[PDB]
Design a protein around this nucleic acid. Structure first.
Lengths: 130, 353, 97, 348, 64, 394, 94, 64, 130
RNA sequence: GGCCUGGGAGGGGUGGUCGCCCCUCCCGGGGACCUGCGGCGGGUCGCCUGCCCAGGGCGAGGUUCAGGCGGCCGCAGGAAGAGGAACGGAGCGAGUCCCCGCGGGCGCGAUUCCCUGAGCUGUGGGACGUGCACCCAGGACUCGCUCACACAUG
RNA sequence: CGCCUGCCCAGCCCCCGAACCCCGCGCGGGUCUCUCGGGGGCGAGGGCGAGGU
């Protein structure tokens, strides 16, 4: 199933998360949404990266046109924030308990899922960079 | 390597120049002009246009305002209004290219839109037939503006096509090729009356503006801003020279008339295009026809009106080949070389003597 | 008030959202005025011309009906009539020589 | 026969099979016709359905109910209603109003299910805007309908675009937001507009002049009901726990607050008796609550129609019949069927 | 909005309402990204469009 | 490589370079009377063009129809007079004519001339015509060789009489047997003949000459002078549809495939290109004098029918050549041709006679009383003028 | 009855109720329409109805008188006309 | 009407009385369709001649 | 023979009936000929379609010139009548009960043969556009 | 339609080059610039003139439609030798028309500013602060300023 | 015959039979213009002792 979504990826969607890492990131988002500790829109995510709030920024790798969110990767590299792509925007929205898609989510750290957060964070920073 | 290139692969108005009729091959070249693609970046932008993909929120006059802030120019025009929520091909002429706006505004447009029907129809074929009915010269009431009731007018729809129909949402994609000034919102209302169910234009996008389309050379507003930024901060022209194109690209459909370098400046000062200065001339020049007059380096001098046909040019030895419609090129791009010719010298000599 | 005479404007086709769409069949292909009163042959006003659309020589028009009228009342190929001063010639809309 | 919630309502036939055609379908309320002949139901498939009153009631097991009409809309149905002065004795009165996304206010004939009329609301640019709410006047002459910051008043006799426009928000002052519900006082010459902007507004019928503007609710208001007294009325909202009781006398502040579980952005309906003594309401949990209005309304009963949201509740105007509509939006995960139901609430 | 498209084998836009093309790929929105004149992310877009060889300057130059 | 071409377009300089080689035109693909304009003998290049007329192909649609014709495929119910009356009614035009009367049940090439092209109808009516008919023999024949021998016999200048008048002579240039069917006694024949040849009468004579007897079953005209059934031939439906498409869609495209300018009928003739000042003079009925000749075609002979054209390729008139090609090339003055039929309208080109040097000289001498009021000599005339000025009235 | 007669032509094969004849008149002179055709003894055979063929060598059909029959005439049997109902080629030729 | 034809390799009509070619296919009738001036099916004829790309305008342009 | 008749075909002769649909149509015509329900030729079919009749219009795909009957397809589409092209002109006339070829016939419905008529009508209504 | 007219020579008849009639032979003449349009080339009861006994009839003539298929007559335009290697342009500005569906568009701030609404909507919707930039450019006509008044150097 | 209905003649379209033509040994088989006979659809060019206002 995962390999079918791999057709729809962008030119700029790297580093793409591994199949198991994608599953870890969704489970971390579900817990963060329950705790009220995420940001969803480009509108939102952009606002709080400017303020300098830390978190793992998860991006949808099938977002088109790329002009809507392609500024965000460099905004993270300016502030050394960890970011990563995932196969689909619909699943990223579904991870946050929504029927409509979204192209970006930033997961904040919190006590209730601190170990799951650190496990995701560790693997995100370890990814090979293009 | 230009020697290897066939004349069919020469750029813009020099394309297929060897298939123009040759009057004379001799002239004195002058180091004055450049090829339109190799204009110094300042001059390149001042004689250029953008094939823009208009965004879906702002009005078309706001968009061209934004372009003239970014590029830092005083004049722009825009090849026909798109309504605030409409997207697609908007030719934005910059500075001296604004002389061409009437030719661009009057050109044939193409649209891809969505009509929403207010009740169910039998199927996609029924919508397809109502579109065939609204082909040809149609009555359309121009919308009220400043409480000024404009009269009923005629506009031609050349072709129509029903691309897709969704019976669930009662949505239908249509493609329309039409005359300038056709109201597509009004077309969808009429298409709804003709079906009997009712209708409204849900969505619209312009896929062609005369010579330019969404197929090639089209850029978004981000490219325009982004290209200017790269030039401002890193002194790189490369990006701007792919966003902006020279106005000669808008004139490649017109019949050509190539002039000697001696004649160029005279025509820019308002002299009529005379026959002793013509090097080459295209097949199919008619009387009272709009033609483009160009240099040997492919630069557009002016839009001219032909007062001789192709055949007449071949037979005659002097006289007015064309009158000016609109001068494109600046004065003193080329030097003044008029009055030096044999007959003109003889005239001035015999007045003095 | 009621006009002295009325000329054939057009015939009834299908209703469309509580106003009636009609095929225009005027002599010399004349075009009606916008908001021109539409009468039945009894010289009773049924409505006013709202839209005019279609090809120049085969055009239609919708009729915004009167206060007391209903779009269900009219039968197929029922004729409607207009005050002849409230027509215009087709030549006006055709291009200048 | 008379209403009695001293006992739990006895089950009577419902429909489940036809709603299960689409995946993740759910009902969007139910409404008895004002004569009590039939019941109208909206659903997520955008199909209004009319079910006749069961013959087996007057005639024990009941078969699964089948609708006499299905009238299809091409977009999300925002609101729908019976004609105010409907009687099954007159074909001219039996019709259903219905508004939908980017479409006109359709009038459907309640016997044949044909499109009978269309009211059309345009903005200043001459583009069609859809009504988010509908309400006929108590005379049945006018059709009031809510939009963003404005009510329009179409005359029922003349179907078309012609309408009296009534702005509720003028120079950043008045009732803001989409007007989500209208309701008229049985006794007084006024109507109440609820909005998705938190506030309630009261307006005089003849002029449309504001009588009052009321706060109270912590979410977007979704429904209104006037008591047959004329003085008292009730309101409810989305993502809001309280059902607020109001009074036209001693106005400005809600008299009481009645608790109910509402955790979705849904129009969870509630309805009074014809006599006005009981008040029934649905819930996102599923539990249908009942209060005796005759002081604060006293809780009478709570029961569970199904293990799912009870979005619609409707009380029959003559008989002791409670109708219940079920279902809600299911939310996904990265890689019970909904139903109408009838219930006998008569005494032993 | 409602208009989508996918490219045919000769690079022409094929418009459609459906979210997937006949080969199972996702269709793009017909409309360009929303623009702001006060956008301050020009550096950022050039930076990664260069990185992934998708900046307009790196594409095959058009034949005029 | 496409990308390599694109890279050269932006890098390297392009220029239409100067050369010393002679400029050679190719006018072989130019339309109608401008075809091989280069190959005409040039008398002079010095004149002032006027910018009044048009290239025949690119006239405005109104002027195009008024100066045009239709190579019609005539349908099988109506008369030829009725057919042209339909076309007159369809195109909304004042006058129409045709290239030879086909009987009601006969089909084929009917050159319908429109308005100002109706000045050519006499020339088209006198042109040679080809037919394909069916002779139905009353009794049986030994074989198709006999019917061919009858057609071989009637090739030449024949006696003929009209159908139901005087005896008339009509030449049949060529005749042929296509095929014969012994069962139904029908034989297809093809004949090339002069105008006014009665094919009904030919079928009767074939019947009498064979001995079996016969009559014409049906007939079709395949050629009418220059136009044939494989040359731009069009039907009454096309004519109606092309007009309709112009009316309802504002599309001239279909009309311009149906109607062709009259100049297409005159492509066979030898050309004489007049100076723009001389055009309107000839339209008013002047002599075609030598001062106004720009170009003239090879192989013009005396008493030959020539087409006299403008520099734009419009036909001014049909004319009879008085001078040969060799005489036009060497002579100083004279009458080159005389009008046969003026095609072009008066005041298409402006009125520009009497402005020249020698014409203005004559006007001055009439004003001075050196010549008489009617331009004739006196005793007081200089011997230079009296000797040199060859008055053509004589 | 004619005063004198001159050769009209010789007999060719018959037709339906007519006799076709090849003309052999002196100086190729053409007979008039509806002119009476005679035998050697000035006895009228019929009347000339149609004339056809080339100007130099041409044919003529004879509508027979009621007494005569087409089958009876012999091969190359000669026929005659009065000289006043003949015409020269020079009327038709130019 | 007896006169039929089939097209030659050169492009010109070969007239015949038979209803089939030497190469098997049916011969067309030599005469054009019947015409009457009351005909009001110009829209109809053009409409389908456009669909199948057999309208006279859509064919290759003639040589003049 | 059916596949051989495609060589003789007309530019505008679509939608063409299949080999099996052609067989079904002939037998529906023959039944309608016995009950005298059909209308044959252009002059009659044009008159009756204009007058207000409905049914199935069977056209002949061998017809030349096309101007004789190419107006009929659009006359059907104005009144929503189904139409279909069969391969031959001579077969249509034989099925229609005439000894000459025919270019068009209109079959009207009847209680005698509604089963065969319904099989043809629904299959002809289902035919794809070219 | 058996065309019209003049002169010379020979023969016959008649009267006072001399007059008239008939026949044969030879020769001359029947003219009047160019182009365009219309009419005549039997049978149209549609109009007018004339004749007879708002009316009726007619073997004659004419105009405008309809029909049939080269020469003469009428009317109209010309009475024509064929010119002109800067004519009479441009670029701006203004006034007036044409064009002309344009309070909406953009950004930031704080209670994550609210919101996955069943309401469009997170590739965005809204509230309150606030600021910001848009509402032309063309063409035509008319009256100014500037630059030229250019036949293009073998 | 002012109008309407009905009838007859002329004209147009479709089907069948006979004669004629072609092939074979009165007999059998296969086509097509004209002519003759029968059936179906359609009056405003002409006529009518019928019916209605």
């Amino acid at each position: 199933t995962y390999q079918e979504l791999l057709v729809n990826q962008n030119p700029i969607a790297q580093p793409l998360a591994s199949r198991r890492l994608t599953r870890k990131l969704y489970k971390c988002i579900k817990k963060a949404v329950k705790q009220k500790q995420i940001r969803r829109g480009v509108k939102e995510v952009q606002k709080f990266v400017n303020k300098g709030e830390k978190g793992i920024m998860v991006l949808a790798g099938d977002t088109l046109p790329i002009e809507v969110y392609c500024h965000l990767p460099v905004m993270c590299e300016d502030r050394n924030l960890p970011y990563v792509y995932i196969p689909s925007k619909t699943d990223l929205g579904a991870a946050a308990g929504s029927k409509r898609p979204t192209c970006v989510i930033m997961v904040k750290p919190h006590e209730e899922y601190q170990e799951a957060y650190d496990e995701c964070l560790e693997e995100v920073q370890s990814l090979p960079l293009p | 390597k230009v020697a290897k290139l066939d004349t069919s692969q020469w750029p813009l108005l020099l394309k297929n120049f060897d298939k123009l009729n040759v009057r004379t091959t001799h002239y004195t070249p002058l180091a004055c002009g450049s090829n339109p693609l190799k204009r110094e970046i300042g001059d390149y932008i001042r004689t250029g246009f953008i094939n823009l993909d208009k965004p879906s929120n702002p009005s078309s006059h706001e968009v061209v305002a934004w372009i003239r802030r970014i590029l830092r120019v005083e004049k722009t025009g825009h090849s026909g209004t798109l309504d605030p929520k409409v997207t697609g091909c908007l030719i934005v002429c910059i500075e001296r290219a604004t002389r061409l706006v009437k030719s661009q505004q009057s050109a044939g447009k193409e649209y891809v839109g969505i009509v929403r029907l207010h009740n169910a129809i039998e199927g996609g074929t029924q919508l397809s037939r109502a579109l065939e009915t609204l082909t040809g010269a149609l009555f359309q009431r121009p919308p009220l503006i400043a409480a000024v009731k404009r009269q009923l007018r005629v506009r031609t729809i050349y072709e129509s096509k029903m691309i897709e129909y969704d019976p669930e949402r009662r949505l239908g994609i249509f493609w329309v090729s039409c005359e300038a000034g056709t109201y597509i919102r009004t077309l969808c209302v009429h298409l709804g009356l003709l079906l009997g169910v009712g209708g409204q234009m849900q969505e619209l996008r312009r896929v062609r503006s005369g010579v330019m389309s969404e197929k090639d050379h089209m850029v978004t507003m981000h490219d325009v801003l982004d290209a200017q930024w790269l030039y401002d901060n890193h002194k790189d022209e490369s990006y701007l020279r792919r966003v902006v194109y020279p106005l000669e690209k808008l004139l490649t459909s017109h019949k050509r008339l190539v002039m000697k370098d001696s004649a160029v400046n005279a025509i820019c000062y308002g002299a009529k295009i005379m026959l002793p200065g013509v090097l080459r001339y295209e097949d199919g020049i008619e009387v009272n026809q709009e033609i483009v007059v160009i240099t040997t380096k492919g630069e557009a001098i002016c839009m001219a009106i032909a007062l001789m046909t192709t055949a007449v040019i071949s037979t005659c030895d002097h006289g007015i080949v064309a009158k000016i419609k609109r001068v494109i090129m600046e004065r003193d791009t080329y030097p003044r070389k008029w009055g030096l010719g044999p007959k003109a010298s003889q005239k001035k000599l015999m007045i003095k003597q | 008030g009621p006009p002295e005479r009325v000329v054939l404007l057009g015939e009834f086709l299908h209703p469309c959202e509580d106003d009636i769409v009609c095929k225009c069949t005027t002599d010399e292909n004349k075009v009606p005025y916008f908001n021109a009163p539409v009468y039945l042959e009894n010289k009773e006003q049924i409505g006013k011309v709202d839209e005019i659309f279609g090809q120049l020589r085969d055009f239609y028009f919708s009729v915004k009906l009167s206060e007391n009228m209903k779009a269900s009342s009219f039968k197929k190929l029922q004729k409607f009539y207009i005050d002849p001063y409230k027509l215009l010639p087709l030549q006006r809309f055709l291009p200048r020589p | 026969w008379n209403y009695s919630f001293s006992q739990l309502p006895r089950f009577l036939s419902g429909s489940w099979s036809e709603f299960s055609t689409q995946p993740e379908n759910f009902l969007k309320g139910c409404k008895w016709a004002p004569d009590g002949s039939c019941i109208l139901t909206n659903s997520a498939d955008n199909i209004l359905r009319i079910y006749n009153l069961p013959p087996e009631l007057y005639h024990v097991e009941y078969a699964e109910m089948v609708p006499v009409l299905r009238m299809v809309e091409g977009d999300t149905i925002y609101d729908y209603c019976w004609y105010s002065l409907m009687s099954s004795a007159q074909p001219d009165t039996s019709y259903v109003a219905s508004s939908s996304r980017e479409n006109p206010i359709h009038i459907w004939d309640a016997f044949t299910g044909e499109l009978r009329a269309s009211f059309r609301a345009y903005n200043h640019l001459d583009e069609l805007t859809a009504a988010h709410s509908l309400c006929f006047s108590p005379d049945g002459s006018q059709l009031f309908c809510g939009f963003n910051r404005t009510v329009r008043v179409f005359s029922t006799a003349r179907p078309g675009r012609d309408c009296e426009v009534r702005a509720t928000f003028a120079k950043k002052q008045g009732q803001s937001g989409i007007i989500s519900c209208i309701a008229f006082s049985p006794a007084q010459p006024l109507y109440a507009c609820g909005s998705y902007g938190r506030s309630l507004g009261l307006y005089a019928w003849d002029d449309g002049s504001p009588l009052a503007l009321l706060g109270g609710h912590q979410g977007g208001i979704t429904h209104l009901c006037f008591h047959p007294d004329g003085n008292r009325f009730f309101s409810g909202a989305r993502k809001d726990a309280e059902l607020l009781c109001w009074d036209l006398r001693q106005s400005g502040y809600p008299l009481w607050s009645l608790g109910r579980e509402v955790t979705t952005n849904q129009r969870i309906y509630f309805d009074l008796d014809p006599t006005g003594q009981f008040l029934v309401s649905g819930s996102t949990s599923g539990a249908v609550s009942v209060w005796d209005t005759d002081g604060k309304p006293e809780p009478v009963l709570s029961f569970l129609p199904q293990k799912d949201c009870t979005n619609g509740v409707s009380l029959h105007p003559s008989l002791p019949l409670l109708a219940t509509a079920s279902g809600q939006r299911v939310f996904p995960e990265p890689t019970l069927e909904c139903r109408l139901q009838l219930w006998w609430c008569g005494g032993a | 909005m409602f208009l989508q498209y996918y490219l045919n084998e000769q690079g022409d836009r094929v418009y459609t309402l459906k979210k997937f093309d006949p080969m199972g790929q996702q269709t793009c929105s017909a409309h360009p990204a929303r623009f702001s004149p006060d956008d301050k992310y020009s550096r950022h877009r050039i930076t990664i469009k260069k990185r992934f060889k998708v900046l307009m300057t790196q594409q095959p130059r058009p034949v005029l």
